[PDB]
Amino acid sequence: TPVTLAKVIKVLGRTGSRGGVTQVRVEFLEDTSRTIVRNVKGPVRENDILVLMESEREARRLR
Amino acid sequence: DNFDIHVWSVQTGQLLDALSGHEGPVSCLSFSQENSVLASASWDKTIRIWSIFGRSQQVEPIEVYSDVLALSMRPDGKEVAVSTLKGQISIFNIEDAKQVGNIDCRKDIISGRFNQDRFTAKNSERSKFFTTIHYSFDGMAIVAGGNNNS
Amino acid sequence: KISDLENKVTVSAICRRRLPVIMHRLKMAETIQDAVKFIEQGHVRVGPNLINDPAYLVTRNMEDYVTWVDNSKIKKTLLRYRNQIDDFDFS
Amino acid sequence: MLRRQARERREYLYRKAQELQDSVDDEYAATSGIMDPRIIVTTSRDPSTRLSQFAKEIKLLFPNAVRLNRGNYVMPNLVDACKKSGTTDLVVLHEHRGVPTSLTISHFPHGPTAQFSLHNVVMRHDIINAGNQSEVNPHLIFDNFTTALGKRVVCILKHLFNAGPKKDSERVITFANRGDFISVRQHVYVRTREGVEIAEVGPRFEMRLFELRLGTLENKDADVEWQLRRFIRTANKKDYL
Amino acid sequence: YKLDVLSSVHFVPKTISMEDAQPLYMSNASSLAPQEIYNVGKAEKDGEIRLKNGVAMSKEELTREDKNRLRRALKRKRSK
Amino acid sequence: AVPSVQTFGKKKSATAVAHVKAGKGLIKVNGSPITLVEPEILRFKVYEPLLLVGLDKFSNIDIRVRVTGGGHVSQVYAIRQAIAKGLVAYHQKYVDEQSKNELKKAFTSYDRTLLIADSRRPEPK
Amino acid sequence: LREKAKERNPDEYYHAMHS
Amino acid sequence: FDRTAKPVPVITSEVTESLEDMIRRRIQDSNFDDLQRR
Amino acid sequence: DFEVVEEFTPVVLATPIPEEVQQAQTEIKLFNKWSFEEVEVKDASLVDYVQVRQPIFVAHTAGRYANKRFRKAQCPIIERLTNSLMMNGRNNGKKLKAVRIIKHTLDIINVLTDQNPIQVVVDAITNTGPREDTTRVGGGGAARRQAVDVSPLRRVNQAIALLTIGAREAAFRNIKTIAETLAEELINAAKGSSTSYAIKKKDELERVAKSNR
RNA sequence: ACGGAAGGGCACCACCAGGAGUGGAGCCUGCGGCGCGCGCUACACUGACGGAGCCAGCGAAACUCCGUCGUGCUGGGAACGAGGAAUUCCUAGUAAGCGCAAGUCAUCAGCUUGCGUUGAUUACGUCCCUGCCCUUUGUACACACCGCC
């Protein structure tokens, strides 16, 4: 599978998430344009690139 | 003379907290402009990086050699310059706590021979320090002045 | 004390804030006769800045920080007699 | 700043001696109702699990309290680091085989340290699963504190709670004197039309004061304001010896 | 003056009239807080009740449900 | 009458007093040379003060270091602190100040725990 | 003497402390 | 023989009944002696 | 052409310093054997979370690296490796034991497969650390999984924990010990052999994430 | 007086990521009336050994080096192989390992308290779950925003 790298730019606070899963608004690197919200598990700062296997599916809440 | 850092809310003019932490009197403060961290600095030879927002109140001390006056902070919020009493300037990164460099500035200020003296005109540590510092808005130049006329 | 400031604050108290007698009560000198010699030679700071006039009244919030300067003969011989002369910070 | 702490504690000793001559007391009158006090609870050294859950019960008992870990914390720099944190009270717990025995209260900004033996404890962690504590800032009730030492211990013992609770504020904490043995329970209630029904929860014990020193915890040169006299030939004849 | 000159480091020096020390030349009560120049208060007659919202509600124009609602609301307003 | 200078360094409870004076190279810990430091695996932790700057800044001096107290690794941290700040004090007051703050910049660029210690104890959360 | 040690005041100096 | 001090006061159902009716009479009076906002 | 001379006398101190030490004074090698130059992280997204830009002499730089949130991502990767390896019931605070077994470990991965041992451990970390993961979503009591991603700090932390606990499980009580079994497990995870416990656990975690994504 | 709804904060009696115990076996102060459980101890190559080295602090072990076995009720120590259901505690010189002193009118010798030695992993955010608390007149005096629980 083609894995892709993508840089976070904003950690969305105040969303109703599962404890231990923080939503984030990541954006790709092959083009610097199209953004996608994902949900990451570990501690995440701003602008540290993370890896994505799925390329198109948007994230949601975790109840 | 109460060794603390008070904070007030400017929306409702009350005392928010008596944000303590030092061991002696503080002398110079600054908030940041990018993360809005506090960078206090006190005569226990210690500067003190505070993060007071968001459930944490994170403290981080940095320990300088001599006594400390005269803090200023770079306008990009990445480092903080502090004077000392031992005629020096230091700069500290604040997402880290390591130094970057110390400008030695105790050989290039000429205090004046007082008319009330026995000593000489150069060796007497009268104002061989910098009572006030500021950065420049590009980020490189630092201007500094003390109780002497330099 | 509110109304009995009529009787106690006299010469013997308003001169007790002087830097020689505060020096002698801090045991930084043998007596006033050479405490005035030290603080006239300009060895003694209070706070960050050096103070030379021997009529200075050290306040309440500055009595804790009336100490000798770095790079002075008396600080050097004090640390020499105690044999703790950490010569990195000038003395 | 050792000369500053020495000068302020010498001024404190003078203020206490002058107040004892011309008899809320002297140590607490600056902060009787203004500052809400903060309480640091520690155990002795390498505590047992039962002692640690007792310290958790004490932290849950009176609020604005943190349960600070105690392993290889040296006592003098512990208390001066607590001073530079600028909180108000320290509470140390000493155990014996899981049964706690000493509760040392130290109002550490140059204040008094009382010490209490702590006889018959009952821990809700090893009896009752009924839920959380109420954790409201409580009311306090005290039974026959009439001696001067009783007023002193009720002052330094109720000046560690949250100041000025409300009417609805539920839980009450009792300190009853039954012959120099301060029995402690704490309850929640409701108002029935017949009356009131209480609900026992949290710890219960009884503590006997045995030292009350004017200095801080670390010094051991502190001048004793009061300690009990176990070996006089009239020990069991009066109270607050 | 004599006390802080004794107890300070640096020295301390000390018909129709006018004044050289003023807040501003230009503003001169044309810069006032609008809340201080007016705030919406209570009513002026017993036929209506106005709120701090900025609306006005009359007891002869209200239905009974909104009248009970407003009575309960100002009951809580008086209660706290 | 030789130009001597004396510095102190200390981690947790160990203490290291260092006498730097104008010599010919030798570096001693309790008389024994610097090649033989006891725990044998932090010998480079005690070497790197005299390895960041080059041995030519140690050709003219000689260092005798007494060390008491503390455990093994606290002792070797105390020796590296005493060596580093003794070298920068000797270069502060007996050779050029440009060499002094060049050494100080090199040490504080490697890590400033080589010069001063975080000697302020804990946070009451 | 323990109390004076705990208040040592580390900046005392006399003429007799030269040797 | 004779003994030094009174022993530990053992907690009996009678003494917890006296403590409970003490505190319930006290809060029926609502005479709890807390601090005040002053 | 160009020339700069600074020292002129042959500097030899009065105490004889070993020749390997005064060779190491030119460039700091790890354990006086391994250069931190020419070590690059062949993967992206784990640079500035591993840290191989500071040549240290031994993995015992005891500075304060844990009193902030993210400032345990700057002490070097082998110091985090030996500190994560030091912990069990039989050993806490046995850090000189942990340093000597990491010394034997990287020495024998040199004597087997000489790339250079810090290069081997760094791309071992990158191949080990998982990339997608599952969490327990609530659902009122249903044991339904859900697929999330992992930040690079979580990838590096779980990578060093998986390598260490894999060497623990591989020399609990059998023939070898922790040094050579960390060597063999780490070279398997560096090559990508899918025979090591680390890549077994990474493939299992990514397989269950792929399954109930 | 009684509910409800909305907003907001906090917490290892919460979520999260882990770590260490209890519970398995023997000795045990106590609490019950044999059970509970607090410490202490054994069970693991992190091993056993055999030489050699070396550092504390109140008032010398762990450790390091050099040699010998050996994956076996083993040499560990007849029994004994790291302990289920569950449960408890814990965020930095902390958990934990290690010894050394003392015995300070209450408790403690089975132990208690100090003292140092070595010293980490993982969160440091979130109110989604468990709960706890607060507010629902903004008065607080600018600018801005909200604007009937």
Side-chain angles (χ1 to χ4, degrees), chain D residues 61 120 141 172-176 183-187 200-206, chain H residues 11-12 15-16 19 23:
Chain D
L61 176 72
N120 305 322
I141 37 181
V172 300
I173 300 193
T174 170
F175 290 82
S183 296
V184 177
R185 283 100 166 86
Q186 65 99 29
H187 299 255
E200 57 262 22
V201 79
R204 75 176 61 240
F205 35 86
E206 66 280 346
Chain H
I11 299 310
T12 318
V15 314
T16 193
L19 200 146
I23 59 167

Side-chain angles (χ1 to χ4, degrees), chain F residues 11-125:
Chain F
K11 213 186 154 57
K12 294 179 174 80
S13 64
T15 316
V17 48
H19 304 282
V20 193
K21 86 170 88 70
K24 37 173 64 177
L26 57 93
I27 293 168
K28 293 187 155 297
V29 169
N30 316 115
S32 317
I34 202 64
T35 308
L36 315 176
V37 187
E38 309 109 350
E40 206 274 301
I41 212 69
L42 318 164
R43 193 182 277 102
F44 281 107
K45 266 311 178 209
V46 82
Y47 277 159
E48 60 183 1
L50 58 94
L51 290 195
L52 287 147
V53 312
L55 302 175
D56 51 354
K57 313 216 184 288
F58 283 79
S59 157
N60 317 109
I61 76 178
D62 64 320
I63 319 181
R64 297 170 293 126
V65 179
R66 300 295 294 244
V67 168
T68 77
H72 282 150
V73 312
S74 314
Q75 268 195 19
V76 71
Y77 279 131
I79 304 185
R80 87 194 269 253
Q81 192 149 332
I83 287 303
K85 95 160 60 179
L87 175 68
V88 77
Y90 183 75
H91 277 208
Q92 157 170 305
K93 70 182 299 291
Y94 287 105
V95 294
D96 314 71
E97 211 172 42
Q98 175 65 26
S99 44
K100 177 248 279 184
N101 65 347
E102 192 262 2
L103 290 192
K104 209 190 280 193
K105 187 208 181 49
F107 284 163
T108 44
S109 199
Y110 187 36
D111 44 349
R112 79 183 310 266
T113 176
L114 202 53
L115 272 176
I116 207 66
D118 208 337
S119 313
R120 277 321 298 128
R121 289 309 106 217
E123 59 93 19
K125 80 207 195 74

Side-chain angles (χ1 to χ4, degrees), chain A residues 20-57:
Chain A
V21 172
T22 83
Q23 286 216 16
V24 79
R25 185 178 187 86
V26 79
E27 53 95 9
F28 293 142
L29 277 184
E30 41 262 31
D31 66 285
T32 60
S33 67
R34 49 181 305 249
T35 80
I36 178 170
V37 284
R38 296 286 308 219
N39 41 359
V40 304
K41 191 179 187 188
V44 54
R45 262 187 314 120
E46 211 165 314
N47 49 52
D48 51 346
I49 53 171
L50 62 95
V51 286
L52 279 156
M53 322 192 49
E54 158 68 32
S55 310
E56 312 154 13
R57 174 196 61 104

Side-chain angles (χ1 to χ4, degrees), chain D residues 16 23 29 34 43 53-54 57-58 63 65 84-85 90 100 112 120 133 162 189 198 201 212 217 221 224-225 228:
Chain D
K16 197 65 74 174
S23 67
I34 308 108
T43 54
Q53 83 187 6
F54 179 55
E57 262 168 311
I58 292 299
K84 79 190 287 183
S85 191
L90 186 74
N120 305 322
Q133 268 87 346
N162 202 29
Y189 63 93
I198 51 148
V201 79
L212 198 144
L217 173 60
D221 291 276
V224 173
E225 192 183 340
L228 88 166

Side-chain angles (χ1 to χ4, degrees), chain D residues 142-212:
Chain D
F142 308 100
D143 198 355
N144 55 94
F145 284 163
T146 46
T147 318
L149 188 72
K151 301 294 188 44
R152 179 77 159 177
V153 63
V154 75
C155 167
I156 72 167
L157 192 55
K158 87 169 150 54
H159 271 165
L160 55 91
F161 281 74
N162 202 29
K166 326 169 63 183
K167 162 176 191 61
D168 178 290
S169 313
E170 202 46 65
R171 44 185 302 182
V172 300
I173 300 193
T174 170
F175 290 82
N177 187 21
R178 308 302 177 210
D180 202 15
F181 281 103
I182 311 184
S183 296
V184 177
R185 283 100 166 86
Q186 65 99 29
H187 299 255
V188 300
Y189 63 93
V190 307
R191 300 293 185 92
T192 79
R193 281 89 170 95
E194 184 262 356
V196 56
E197 284 307 302
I198 51 148
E200 57 262 22
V201 79
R204 75 176 61 240
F205 35 86
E206 66 280 346
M207 40 210 286
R208 160 168 49 186
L209 206 157
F210 66 91
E211 280 190 2
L212 198 144

Side-chain angles (χ1 to χ4, degrees), chain I residues 111-128:
Chain I
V111 80
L112 270 70
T113 163
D114 39 358
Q115 284 114 317
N116 66 85
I118 35 182
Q119 177 47 63
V120 165
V121 77
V122 159
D123 51 15
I125 285 307
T126 68
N127 258 315
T128 288

